[PDB]
Amino acid sequence: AGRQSRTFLVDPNLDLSIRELVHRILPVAASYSAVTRFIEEKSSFEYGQVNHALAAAMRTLVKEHLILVSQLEQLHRQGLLSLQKLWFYIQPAMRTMDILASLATSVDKGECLGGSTLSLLHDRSFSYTGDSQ
Amino acid sequence: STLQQSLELKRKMLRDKQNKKNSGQHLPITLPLASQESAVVEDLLYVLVGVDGRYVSAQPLAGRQSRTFLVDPNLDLSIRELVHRILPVAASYSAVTRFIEEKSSFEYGQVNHALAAAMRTLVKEHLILVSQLEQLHRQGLLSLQKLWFYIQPAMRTMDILASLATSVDKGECLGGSTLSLLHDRSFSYTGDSQ
Amino acid sequence: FSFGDPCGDRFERDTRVSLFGALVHSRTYDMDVRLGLPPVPDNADLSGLAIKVPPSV
Amino acid sequence: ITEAALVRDILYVFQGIDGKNIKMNNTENCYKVEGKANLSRSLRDTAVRLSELGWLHNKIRRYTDQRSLDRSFGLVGQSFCAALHQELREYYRLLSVLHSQLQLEDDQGVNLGLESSLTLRRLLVWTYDPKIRLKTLAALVDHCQGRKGGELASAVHAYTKTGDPYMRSLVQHILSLVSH
Q: Which letter, b or e, does each residue of D29-39 get, where b requires 16 or more Cβ atoms within 10 Å of its Cβ?
């Protein structure tokens, strides 16, 4: 509904602990979906070279995310993936995707373009002064 | 509990050491015999962790004393006496663990904290041993006589540790007084290589 | 997006192999290790249980 | 109540989730075992010991959520929150490793009375040092509560003098990260 994060319906008959873990992980998937939507929309030639390049970088990171997800899928297919192992492995990935999505949402709210977009990027880079990654 | 005395020792050591430490580092801020044996094993594995068992329950600790236990009167007199002989080790372990966990705080200073930490590490090793004995019981490999034999050295170690803990607690030894007490205890253990 | 490998800092390395200090007497880099404790020594029924002194090295 | 069910509940509590038989008592800010008679008093105490870890986890997560939203914490405050989150990530990795070990124990199905078997007592032993670590971290959070900037730096400098060598190393690493 609108420029909101994607919401999910979970089967109510799931274990409460399982349901809570799902609700804890789902924020990462919502951020991923929002980031992918932003990347796919702002990837139009109409977005100018700066926004296009930003979208391309986001696409590269999404590809890396997909690779990771495929390896986790393999582990599950290998039966080597536990729910806690998945949560642990995605927690840093979840945070990375959430940071990227927050930046995307801030750029979108500011409709930053060209030099204003570059200024916003600089300010965001200062905003991550405490987060080396 | 020894934990409360050790935490108080930590606070005292922090104040005295801050005045002593010109170094500007602030401290951080009807039962079958086999079934009776199984129940006593369960209680001891709980007692080894300081938890009351179903048939053997701990009495409240009066002062800096070893923890006392209430045992079901319907236990075998020989079994009850063996339990009371072994329970001193678990009581010493519980008191030592409380003291170790409290006085390992930075407020007790690195010397008292390290002493408590070493006690905690040895208590951890004791807990590992107790868990292995619990596994043997679950494996059926733990007999009452084997348990008594295996705990006899453990009983002596826990008794020595409890005597040291009680001496430190009675003396409120801190820093150089604690180091003096440690030296005197090391001379006191001239006959005990361990 | 990963918990960075604790190859650099000795404290981080020990934290990883100790699982943030959870491990007492073991260190491991393998995530698939089955955690075991040391077996009960054979002389425990003969000699009692001695307090294991950590080696000075 | 099966021991495996208690293990599951404890793993949920480590994630801050109420188990089937162990639920968080908000009045005690700890997971409480449901009053069903068949829980051993020893088992209850072990559950309480694990819920102390869950209480610390929940406190840490509350702190992280409280400070991640505060832009006013400044760069130093953000760095402190980042250090706390990094330590929380390490803790969650450790918890995941423990969970994977529990899953391995569930998958093997055998109550092997070997000294290597993951018992609730053995689990408590393996998490005792982690429990002490988490207790230290929670005490540090409490002492640094409400401090920012130079007050946070002063709290960090005070924390470097800890007597516990593991705590001392951890606090030194945290001090270096916050000072960066």
A: ebbbbeeeeeb
